[PDB]
Amino acid sequence: MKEYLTRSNISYFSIGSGTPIIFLHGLSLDKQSTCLFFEPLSNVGQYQRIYLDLPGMGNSDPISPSTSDNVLETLIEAIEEIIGARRFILYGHSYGGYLAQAIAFHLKDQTLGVFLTCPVITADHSKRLTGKHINILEEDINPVENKEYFADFLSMNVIINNQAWHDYQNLIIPGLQKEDKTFIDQLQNNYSFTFEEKLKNINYQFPFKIMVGRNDQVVGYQEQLKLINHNENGEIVLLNRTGHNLMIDQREAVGFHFDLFLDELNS
Amino acid sequence: MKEYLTRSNISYFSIGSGTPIIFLHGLSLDKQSTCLFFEPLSNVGQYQRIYLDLPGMGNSDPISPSTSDNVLETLIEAIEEIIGARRFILYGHSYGGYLAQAIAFHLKDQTLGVFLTCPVITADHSKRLTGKHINILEEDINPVENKEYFADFLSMNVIINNQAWHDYQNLIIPGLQKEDKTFIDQLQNNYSFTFEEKLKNINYQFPFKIMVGRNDQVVGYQEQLKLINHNENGEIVLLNRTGHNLMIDQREAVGFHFDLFLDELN
Ligand SMILES: [Cl-]
Ligand SMILES: [Cl-]
């Protein structure tokens, strides 16, 4: 597909016309993870799908200062270049979901809806309430290609079978291969927004939907559940046998629920 | 096909062979509400599907005393007769999901799994945390048949369209026509289990999945979110634009999640 680059040096794909969806991928991943996942699903066709590479990931340059504040500013700049003041839908995974929240919180009137998978809500890892990873070993797998990533797959994915390994290689490996680890490490020294507590308390005035796994040792599920009651339009799906690579563990659930979420907005 | 009756005077359907699924319906409904919904939306094929009419509802006789404790007792008798000691899966809607919880608590070693839609957790209506009901008026409906039932459809369902009205007529009205209002009215005076608090604190040691709706004014969602708090195998689906007739508002979602649940257990 055709890769574009904003003047703010954010690499992205843009496909389709109609209401924009801005997809923000997880930490160490890239737009392959989002693009390859959502393009196959029946009802994103009517939308303009915009898959960004975060700074220091994919084909997007690292940025100085290497802080979450600068990431947010750069992504806001980027979105304006791409769609201007047109109203948009947000999708976010992991740190992508943290930034999705920050954007929704700052561009309240321009945001139509937010859908998050395994989102970061507390940036500081030492503060997070996390779950316990496990494996459900469904099938024997004999890896040929990408053998060197197999442990990370096993350490991250919950449901272990051939399709999950194929998905990991297709969606996760590309980002791992491009991530700027030094940039990420520096970012993590200035990772938490000063308004993080506001994100934890805000009652968004549009659909706000979260999918979390019981076995997600990176961001867990508790803190996300706590966002739900006070969010008037807050939805949650929390599932067993599901971890941080929730979109592989529960491929079909994410497709189903993303579609159901678009239905909400369509109404 | 065939309708069955236990020695305990519980009316039921039982379809297929295999691991048993015991389906419990909501208050005032009957086993048409469960049977007609799940049999078509089915990855239920490899299971034995058992759809019970609760006492005083459907074609199951009322009981004395008319208390939830005794409703539970009757149901335990019924299950033991129908499946003995076989391990089983539980489905419960609303009052049926309250009973389901009780059953799983009582038959903890036999219960493989519990799937609940809009479950009663606190029986006492005056103590429940509930949502605000709304309608999403998608189409005009000009009812011809069952016009006298239309108010309660509007009052309960959230998503209002013609399909929702057809489903309501096929799923909810048969139970309405059969319910023993006198039993139910009496049952509602001894509605809490004597052990009710123990249900609110159990950490079930098998998958325990709940679907709830933001706009459910009957049982809400908050108490159910809190159960997921202390359940290590707790799952929850909480959706907007959804009320107490969740199987009608979110028909696809229920079949999807119930299939997923079965897979979880398999
Ligand atoms: Cl490339
Ligand atoms: Cl009485």
Side-chain angles (χ1 to χ4, degrees), chain A, chain B residues 1-40 42-266:
Chain A
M1 246 189 327
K2 294 183 308 319
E3 171 168 316
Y4 305 94
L5 187 61
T6 58
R7 283 191 299 244
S8 42
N9 282 314
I10 288 296
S11 164
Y12 61 100
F13 297 134
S14 180
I15 329 175
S17 46
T19 304
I21 308 167
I22 304 302
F23 296 83
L24 301 184
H25 62 69
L27 191 69
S28 306
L29 304 181
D30 79 351
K31 66 197 186 296
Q32 293 300 119
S33 76
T34 54
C35 189
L36 295 184
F37 184 83
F38 292 97
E39 289 296 305
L41 81 73
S42 40
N43 302 304
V44 300
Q46 59 246 277
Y47 296 83
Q48 174 189 352
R49 295 86 71 184
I50 296 162
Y51 304 101
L52 303 184
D53 275 330
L54 299 183
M57 287 170 258
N59 295 335
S60 277
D61 293 330
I63 61 184
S64 267
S66 57
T67 72
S68 283
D69 291 336
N70 196 189
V71 182
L72 181 55
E73 174 197 342
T74 298
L75 290 173
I76 290 165
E77 281 171 19
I79 291 161
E80 282 161 20
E81 282 186 59
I82 307 167
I83 57 162
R86 309 308 302 276
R87 297 213 291 166
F88 56 86
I89 304 155
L90 279 171
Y91 170 86
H93 188 72
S94 170
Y95 178 68
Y98 188 65
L99 300 168
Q101 292 161 86
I103 295 165
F105 176 81
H106 287 100
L107 300 189
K108 57 209 172 144
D109 299 327
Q110 197 182 168
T111 304
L112 297 181
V114 180
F115 189 98
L116 305 185
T117 55
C118 314
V120 165
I121 176 55
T122 302
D124 183 353
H125 290 85
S126 67
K127 281 202 179 217
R128 303 188 184 169
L129 306 180
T130 55
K132 188 167 195 159
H133 180 259
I134 73 192
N135 290 117
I136 300 305
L137 299 168
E138 300 194 331
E139 300 193 304
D140 274 339
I141 305 176
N142 303 115
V144 206
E145 207 145 24
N146 303 124
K147 282 189 307 81
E148 76 270 23
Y149 302 97
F150 200 67
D152 276 313
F153 159 68
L154 290 174
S155 75
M156 200 61 70
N157 286 241
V158 172
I159 286 151
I160 306 306
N161 57 42
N162 287 291
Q163 182 66 54
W165 173 234
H166 268 271
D167 288 2
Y168 178 91
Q169 283 175 272
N170 280 334
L171 299 184
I172 306 300
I173 291 176
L176 296 176
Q177 286 176 326
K178 297 183 167 164
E179 69 160 330
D180 184 326
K181 281 158 215 156
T182 306
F183 174 74
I184 299 339
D185 177 78
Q186 291 300 300
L187 185 55
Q188 283 183 157
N189 295 328
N190 292 295
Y191 205 41
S192 290
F193 295 124
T194 62
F195 55 89
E196 189 173 277
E197 208 67 28
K198 281 161 149 231
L199 299 185
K200 284 179 181 161
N201 295 130
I202 187 47
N203 176 11
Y204 293 109
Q205 286 311 102
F206 36 70
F208 179 76
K209 178 161 199 184
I210 297 179
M211 300 191 77
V212 277
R214 174 65 63 164
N215 302 117
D216 182 325
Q217 78 281 24
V218 187
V219 300
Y221 57 90
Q222 288 191 47
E223 286 186 82
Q224 296 91 345
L225 273 168
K226 187 170 181 166
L227 299 178
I228 308 302
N229 179 53
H230 68 59
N231 263 95
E232 259 179 88
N233 303 302
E235 310 180 278
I236 193 155
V237 184
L238 165 54
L239 288 181
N240 290 328
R241 300 176 358 146
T242 299
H244 207 50
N245 285 344
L246 177 141
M247 75 295 263
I248 304 176
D249 288 331
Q250 299 298 337
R251 185 178 53 75
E252 306 84 337
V254 173
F256 181 76
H257 277 292
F258 193 68
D259 285 326
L260 212 55
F261 171 80
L262 300 168
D263 279 352
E264 288 183 72
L265 299 168
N266 158 38
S267 165
Chain B
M1 261 278 263
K2 179 153 166 94
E3 178 172 7
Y4 292 99
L5 184 61
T6 61
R7 297 187 282 282
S8 40
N9 297 307
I10 290 298
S11 184
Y12 69 100
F13 301 121
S14 171
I15 318 156
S17 263
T19 296
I21 315 164
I22 307 305
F23 297 88
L24 307 172
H25 63 69
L27 192 71
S28 300
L29 297 185
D30 75 356
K31 64 190 185 305
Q32 302 296 109
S33 70
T34 50
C35 192
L36 285 191
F37 186 79
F38 293 93
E39 284 300 302
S42 53
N43 209 160
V44 302
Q46 247 222 331
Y47 297 84
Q48 186 187 349
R49 294 86 73 187
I50 299 157
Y51 306 98
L52 298 189
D53 277 329
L54 304 181
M57 305 171 231
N59 293 331
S60 288
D61 287 346
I63 62 184
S64 313
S66 48
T67 71
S68 287
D69 285 352
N70 196 208
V71 172
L72 173 58
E73 168 63 27
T74 311
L75 292 181
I76 285 167
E77 287 172 33
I79 290 162
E80 298 196 4
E81 162 174 352
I82 300 169
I83 61 160
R86 291 165 66 205
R87 282 166 330 257
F88 62 89
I89 299 166
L90 276 164
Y91 170 87
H93 180 62
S94 197
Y95 184 64
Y98 186 59
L99 292 162
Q101 289 166 85
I103 290 160
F105 168 69
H106 278 266
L107 306 179
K108 68 176 116 150
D109 289 339
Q110 217 172 324
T111 300
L112 293 161
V114 181
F115 189 103
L116 309 177
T117 56
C118 313
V120 177
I121 306 148
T122 297
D124 191 331
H125 291 88
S126 73
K127 297 188 158 179
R128 297 175 188 183
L129 304 178
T130 69
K132 287 185 207 178
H133 178 258
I134 60 175
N135 294 128
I136 301 322
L137 185 162
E138 302 196 342
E139 274 162 8
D140 287 318
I141 318 182
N142 278 284
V144 173
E145 318 290 312
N146 297 122
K147 291 172 172 157
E148 64 270 37
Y149 296 100
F150 198 66
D152 283 338
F153 162 71
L154 297 177
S155 287
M156 208 51 67
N157 288 238
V158 165
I159 300 324
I160 308 302
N161 54 49
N162 293 288
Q163 190 64 62
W165 175 235
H166 309 153
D167 288 5
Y168 177 93
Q169 293 175 90
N170 295 335
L171 306 175
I172 305 302
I173 301 176
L176 297 177
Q177 289 173 332
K178 291 184 162 290
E179 57 158 337
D180 176 339
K181 297 183 184 183
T182 305
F183 178 75
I184 285 183
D185 176 75
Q186 292 173 353
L187 177 68
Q188 283 181 297
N189 305 321
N190 288 263
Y191 205 41
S192 308
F193 297 123
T194 53
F195 56 84
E196 166 175 291
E197 287 81 357
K198 302 317 180 274
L199 283 193
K200 292 182 162 179
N201 305 122
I202 314 179
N203 180 6
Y204 296 97
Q205 305 287 100
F206 34 71
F208 176 69
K209 189 165 177 173
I210 300 175
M211 294 187 80
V212 282
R214 175 61 66 156
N215 307 119
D216 193 324
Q217 79 279 29
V218 183
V219 300
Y221 55 86
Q222 290 194 62
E223 306 183 68
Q224 299 76 0
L225 272 44
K226 181 172 193 257
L227 302 168
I228 299 313
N229 208 43
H230 51 76
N231 269 94
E232 67 190 309
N233 310 301
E235 306 181 281
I236 198 153
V237 185
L238 172 57
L239 299 174
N240 294 328
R241 316 202 324 157
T242 302
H244 202 59
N245 295 339
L246 190 149
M247 79 290 296
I248 298 167
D249 289 332
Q250 297 294 345
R251 172 177 226 77
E252 293 179 6
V254 179
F256 175 80
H257 277 286
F258 188 68
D259 285 356
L260 204 66
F261 180 68
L262 287 179
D263 293 28
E264 195 188 339
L265 270 40
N266 194 350

